[PDB]
From a paper:
Apoptosis repressor with caspase recruiting domain (ARC) is a multifunctional modulator of apoptosis. Human ARC contains 208 amino acids and is composed of two distinct domains, N-terminal caspase recruiting domain (CARD) domain and C-terminal P/E (proline and glutamic acid) rich domain. ARC CARD interacts directly with the death domains (DD) of Fas and FADD, as well as with the death effector domains (DEDs) of procaspase-829.
The high resolution structure of ARC CARD showed that it comprises five helices, H1 to H5, which is not the typical fold of the DD superfamily. Interestingly, the sixth helix (H6) was not detected at the typical location, indicating that H6 might be flexible in the CARD domain of ARC or adopt a loop structure instead. There were two monomers in the asymmetric unit, chain A and chain B. The model of chain A was built from residue 5 to residue 87 and residue 91 to residue 93, while that of chain B was built from residue 5 to residue 84. The helix bundle from H1 to H5 was tightly packed by a central hydrophobic core composed of I12, V20, L23, L30, L31, L34, L35, L40, L48, V58, L61, L62, L64, V65, L76, and L77. The two ARC CARDs in the asymmetric unit are packed as an asymmetric dimer with an interface composed primarily of an electrostatic interaction. The principal interaction forces are salt bridges and hydrogen bonds, which are made by D13 (on H1), R56 (on H4), R59 (on H4), and R60 (H4) from chain A and by D32 (on H2), R37 (on H2), E46 (on H3), and D49 (on H3) from chain B. Although a unique disulfide bond-mediated homo-dimeric structure of the CARD domain including NOD1 and CARMA1 has been reported, the current structure of ARC CARD was dimerized via a Type I interface, which is a novel method for the homo-dimeric CARD structure. The size exclusion chromatography and MALS experiment showed that the dimeric ARC CARD became a monomer via mutations of interface residue D49R, R56E, and R59E, and double mutants.
Numbering used by the authors: 5 to 86, 91 to 95
The structure:
Amino acid sequence: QERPSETIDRERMRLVETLQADSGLLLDALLARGVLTGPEYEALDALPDAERRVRRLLLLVQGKGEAACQELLRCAQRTAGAWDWQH
């Protein structure tokens, strides 16, 4: 069905809204899983704007492909959680 990168594209607003408060922890979780490099993680951790921080993480992760996207979503949903109106 839906590719992880497509999930991120469709849920971009919700992810950006629900992940801001704990974006540091998310960065940490993703560094510890190899999804981010050290420099990537520093660059993102240093952004003072937490919304832009999440927005850029999402883009960075979409650019790395589907596995990276899955990893972000699995970490995301631990803090943010996972009707049929699209039909």
